[PDB]
Design a protein around this ligand. Structure first.
Ligand SMILES: Nc1ncnc2c1ncn2[C@@H]1O[C@H](COP(=O)(O)OP(=O)(O)O)[C@@H](O)[C@H]1O
Ligand SMILES: [Mg+2]
Lengths: 788, 754
DNA sequence: AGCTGCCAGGCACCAGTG
DNA sequence: ACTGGTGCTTGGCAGCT
């Protein structure tokens, strides 16, 4: 509680506070000898989070300074505890030599670990992307950018309204979200993880243009298709600024940025994504999703690509025909290709570490093991006549020169780190073999000296050993210690042994340690040199990884189509969906009865189906599976049906029934087009009897007669089956059921026309409502049916 | 590690921690399971470090897993329903062991709180009651029999423990229970002709004894809960009223978050029991009421003193099991010190019950004085290293400590002696496991060491030595300290011998202190929260004047609107129309909370409540299948003494189907069951019910259109609603104007037929 | 094969001679 | 201003049983 002016502090705390001032809201690991230290509330916080001791560094002038810390070699385990709780940590290191330093040794922050910029294998999940995003809002729209720092994939977009922006955050699921201080729609964003408020000036348009061109080495961003997009460039500017500030090295794997137009994909609202269960079931988990079914990729990078595709269907007809083509060609070849692709591993993330210069020995080894599969894949894919498959074979590369480089440079199975040597192999550098060979009197020399001195002295307890603190020694037991040569100079004393040193053992100590250190310092120069020779080829290597990943997805999708009995869909010119014996791709796996296949005929003249049928009749499944088939068709995949013809689809909307249901419904009515697939599931709620139904009725009318979209409209309201009569483009279908005394069977089959009756009382009876009460409700019911 | 597999065979159905240096190790399916539950990794290995073991045990026991520890041999086992250690328990949450079993007649159920020794027994008549007892009691560990049909009752539950059929034999269960209690028969606890419940209680106690391998002398009694003794609340109702736990599985915005301002964790747990088990016997209720009125003026004085009494109940458990640690005894002493101050404060209270608690609370001045002398002010966590017995308690101990201190003082002066005598300013005297005492000199000065010094250990920058003088006094220190430590331990075990004869009385005290905590709390809650004392009538009825929902009114900073209620046998059912938006559901839910609180003996949020007998409370308030299943249960089980609250049934099916069931339900509830009922509905067509039959009236909620919004009033008014608001809400949400115009047209067309 | 306690190394603090 | 001791976080492992 003293006045903590600059002069009141020790030279050390002056330096620590300037560094902390650059990172005021986040934890600062501050290298001091063998320990990262934290101070003040960082220490206190660290103590709770990491479960380490909160103590004090003593102080002559005033208050003791709260302190905690960890040994430098245990850091990665502590970084993991933090990043999993969404915490950033600024890592500070000693740059200077203490012996040539008057005051405190020079200290820089060299890195900042944040949830969205982590690239180490230990902190990531193999099969999930981990993205950094930036968001900003004008009075008019949103800018959004994402970056996979462990792949270079750098994207820009401009969502026009609240609900697309929501859909975009849902889809990309950023691990860390940078946002502007003036952001108005905080409902999209509060209660997200890795939330990071930024000042407005980081989203300035001129600085982003300048920094992105600098990064890409371009004059303008014309070539990238984003010069057009200031809204998005602003968020991209911030993102890149934050990415540079965390890593504090060059980032040469970020060579490109791509715009994501609304026209290029099918925009699925937030409800659609949740209700289709693409990678997340409605109960939060990852089981019984569409990905649980379709995803038997064999590489991490492949699984991450497949999930991105599921999530972003493409509209380019050419790309889709190329994908389908590939899938049909490789059908026979999946048993041969999968085991081999598996061995390539996560080459994508390894190349990120190569680019960041963080790549460990076992990354280089696994890169080598990937290069070694290329020829078998090249040979396996030659046979396959498919122009798209050959284009991937070509992009996949070979890198025989680099494969040999790593085969000669690094041993078969190196250790986890370079810190303690034993990575570079014999023959690679002859100066190293000479330095290493001097540090191999460890075998012969020391032992011949033991024997020799034991026999010369006659003292049978005499041994030669080493310890790190006192060095090489000759040990005699305490019983015999008094008979040792008077030449033996004393070095270390123990309870029951005395240890000594002689000029010849000292001479050997001095050469083994100065040559072990020189063998390490050359080995680390040589290993950092491996980066120099690999890095020039990084562009080709990244293209290669993406080719293998694509190959893995497409090989998987081919194998899926065979095993799960799927067909190739075709595309038509105008809106419409014709399905023959289609199935819910997920429900038909997780369900131990037969799945009843069902057709669907949707067109511009038959654009709205009023779906009826009893509760648990199959109404929602029918809708979901329609959308899932649409989705699977539009990633390029074969589809769970006897046959599918499908027209263009711009957006998919879903409403699954307070103020929220009506607002959602309004967004649909405002943004759906003749090309949209609209799924309304028992909407329309009011405070009285017909209140809610009248809204649903007017809504349907607007969808049918003014919007002309392709709507599926499940209802409990039998009154809506009068709609086809009155309204062009509308028709009735129902889910079939059979009554037969005290019971009801759900047939799960779509028929044309309205249900003959509604089965609410039958469902009530099934649920256990007393027979006497159902007797009375049927009586009442007939009174009502007699009105008309 | 063939040693691991054969120890795993010893207890194959239980997880097995297996010691390895710093860690406990789990292999095979043990590892799989444990990484799933604890957020740790695989290798099929899994490691849990030694310094944190108690923590990981507490999680696994919280999740229904027994654990075996192994140091080779299985030395210790923790089962979820039999722990009494403080680190393994949650202060304000009960933790029961339970046993269920089925007969060709009906169910048998028993529960034990192993800390308090509260032992219960029941004989649920059908499966629904049984399911309601399982939700209510939420046992940490459930014993069941091999021959058990109704597995859907207990399928999903944690802590399941399949047991042989012979473990439920009646004659063996009687003998064991009568041994446990010092009785020849069970007539005195009122359970001697309840054989099914006894069979469950026999298995539970066998199992409890087996987990402990100790007498359980604090289990001296068993009580039988009865159907008619309490207000039955099925699981759905219990969850809907948000008594201890909210709908999101939390502790906030719940009846306990407002009512439970108790000051000891033992009284908190007792209040939560009271809330989940409303009693019907108005005698007991009338006593709690009188007590809450009489204690009003004594609340501020009592609660600070009561607070200091602490969780005496659970400490007493560890006295019974002989695991109490020094701070248990200190906390227990600290609580004895409060008894005089509580006796004085309560003496003046005009209440027979408060005075009966005040006696039952006791004094224990001899035990207070014993622990004042025996133990120091703030003893360490463990007895293991001593420093727990205070000076003056034992003459032998004091003398051993004095010779220790003097041998220790001599070695301090030996340091100063040697240090001035040699002139070497770095000379000190350390102690060590390996070398005992030693003299240290720094490496720079170590060559000036006296010739009599004997090197034992070189360090990087010092040298340590013994002389025989060091060794001589070292002997005096370690022997004296060791005699003192053996004596502290024996004197500490002697405290258990002096306390335990008074255990029956101590348990009575803690139980009384807990009740008082609760009543003093409810008394302060009535005065602070403007509650009133409800009166009981002889026939079904609820008259509320200006009643409120006790949670909603403390939580939301919008003014709470109070409402009347008038249910009698001539006015059994209200049809409630108008917008919902939480207003209807709150009025229904506050009715149930007021009934519940009345039948806990608490005061209630109102100006006046009169209330007849209630046997059951049903609230269907929140698929169409789930709505109908809950409705079926109401219709099958409700009586003329029941309170039924229904939230717009008929939603999720056709208009005419949902209207037909609604009308049939209302009609059945009014003309057959005759239950007191609040029937919320959107069907305007149901407002004709009052014209067709006696006992039914219409009430409603309106809204108010103003400015650019709508204000949904929470005032219940006589008569039917004359307005719908679904289209106005659509308009406000931005549904295009032309669409609303059409819906307005369609709505008129639809209602005008009707 | 378990337990204890020195050590890793920057820095400030501190107390004994200039 | 200086020589030479001590203190401080956790994890590794030497030096004891
Ligand atoms: N075509 C089908 N074949 C077999 N089972 C089906 C089929 N469609 C639906 N089901 C099953 O019936 C259940 C009810 O489906 P659902 O679409 O939710 O009915 P609804 O929405 O009309 O109430 C689903 O859980 C699913 O398992
Ligand atoms: Mg449905």
């Amino acid at each position: 509680s003293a006045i903590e002016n600059f002069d009141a502090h020790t030279p050390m705390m002056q330096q620590y506070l300037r560094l902390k001032a650059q990172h005021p809201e986040i934890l600062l690991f501050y290298r001091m000898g063998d320990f990262y230290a934290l101070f003040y509330d960082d220490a206190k916080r660290a103590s709770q989070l990491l479960d380490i001791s909160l103590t004090k560094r003593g102080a002559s002038a005033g208050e003791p300074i709260p302190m905690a810390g960890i040994p430098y070699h245990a850091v990665e385990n502590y970084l993991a505890k933090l990043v999993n709780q969404g915490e950033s940590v600024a890592i500070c290191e000693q740059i200077g030599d203490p012996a040539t330093s008057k005051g405190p040794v020079e200290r820089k922050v060299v890195r900042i670990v944040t949830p969205g910029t982590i690239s180490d294998e230990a902190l990531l999940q193999e099969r999930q992307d981990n993205l950094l995003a930036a968001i900003w809002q004008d009075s008019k729209g949103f800018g959004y950018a994402t970056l996979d720092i462990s792949s270079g994939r750098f994207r820009l977009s401009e969502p026009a309204d609240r609900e697309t922006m929501a859909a975009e955050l849902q889809r990309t699921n950023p691990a860390e979200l940078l946002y502007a201080e003036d952001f108005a729609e905080m409902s999209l964003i509060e209660g997200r993880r890795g939330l990071r408020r930024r000042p407005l000036w980081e989203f300035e348009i001129d600085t982003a243009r300048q920094q992105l061109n600098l990064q890409f080495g371009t004059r303008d961003l014309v070539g990238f298709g984003v010069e057009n997009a200031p809204r998005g460039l602003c968020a991209a500017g911030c993102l890149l600024q934050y990415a540079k500030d965390t890593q504090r090295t060059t980032l040469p794997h970020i060579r490109s940025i791509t715009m994501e137009r609304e026209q290029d994909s099918i925009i699925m609202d937030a409800a659609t994504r949740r209700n289709l269960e693409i990678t997340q079931n409605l109960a939060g988990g990852a089981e019984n999703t569409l990905a649980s079914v379709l995803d038997c990729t064999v590489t991490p990078m492949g699984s991450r690509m497949l999930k991105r595709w599921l999530h972003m269907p493409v509209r380019d007809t050419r790309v889709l025909l190329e994908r389908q083509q590939t899938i049909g060609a490789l059908q026979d070849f999946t048993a041969g290709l999968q085991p081999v692709l598996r061995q390539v591993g996560d080459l994508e993330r390894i190349l990120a570490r190569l680019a960041l210069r963080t790549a460990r020995p076992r990354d280089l080894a696994r890169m080598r093991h990937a290069f070694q599969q290329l020829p078998e894949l090249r040979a396996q894919l030659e046979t396959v006549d498919s122009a798209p498959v050959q284009a991937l074979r070509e992009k996949m590369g070979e890198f025989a020169e680099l494969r040999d480089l790593l085969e000669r440079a690094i041993i078969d199975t190196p250790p986890v780190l370079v810190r303690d040597g034993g990575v570079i192999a014999s023959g690679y550098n002859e100066e190293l073999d000479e330095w290493r060979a001097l540090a191999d009197g460890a075998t012969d020399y020391l032992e011949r000296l033991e024997v020799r001195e034991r026999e010369r002295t006659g003292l049978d307890t005499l041994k030669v050993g080493f310890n790190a603190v006192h060095g090489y020694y000759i040990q005699i037991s305490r019983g015999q210690s008094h008979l040792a040569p008077i030449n033996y100079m004393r070095r270390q004393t123990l309870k029951n042994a005395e240890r000594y040193i002689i000029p010849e053992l000292k001479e050997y100590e001095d050469k083994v340690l100065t040559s072990k250190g020189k063998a390490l310092a050359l080995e680390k120069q040589l290993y950092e040199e491996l980066f120099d020779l690999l890095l020039p080829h990084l562009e080709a290597l990244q293209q290669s990884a993406s080719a293998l990943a694509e190959l893995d997805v497409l090989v998987n999708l081919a194998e899926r189509a065979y095993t799960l009995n799927y067909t190739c869909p075709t595309f038509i010119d105008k809106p419409g969906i014709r399905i023959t014996e289609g199935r819910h791709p997920v429900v038909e796996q997780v369900l131990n009865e037969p799945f009843i296949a069902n057709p669907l005929n949707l067109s511009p003249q038959r654009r709205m189906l009023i779906i009826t049928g009893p509760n648990m009749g199959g109404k929602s499944t029918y809708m979901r599976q329609t959308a899932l088939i649409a989705l699977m068709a539009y990633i390029g995949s074969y589809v769970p049906a006897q046959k599918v013809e499908i027209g263009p689809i711009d957006r998919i909307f879903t409403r699954v029934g307070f103020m929220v249901e009506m607002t959602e419904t309004a967004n649909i009515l405002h943004n759906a087009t003749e090309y949209s697939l609209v799924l309304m599931d028992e909407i329309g709620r009011g405070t009285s009897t017909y209140d809610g139904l009248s809204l649903a009725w007017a809504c349907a009318e607007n969808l049918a007669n003014k919007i002309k979209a392709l709507t599926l409209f499940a209802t409990h309201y039998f009154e809506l089956t009068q709609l086809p009569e009155k309204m062009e483009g509308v028709a009735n279908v129902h889910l079939d059921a059979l009554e037969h005394g005290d019971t009801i069977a759900f047939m799960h089959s779509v028929q044309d026309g309205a249900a003959s009756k509604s089965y609410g009382l039958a469902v009530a009876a099934l649920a256990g409502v007393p027979k006497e009460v159902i007797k009375r409700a049927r009586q009442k019911l007939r009174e009502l049916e007699s009105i008309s």
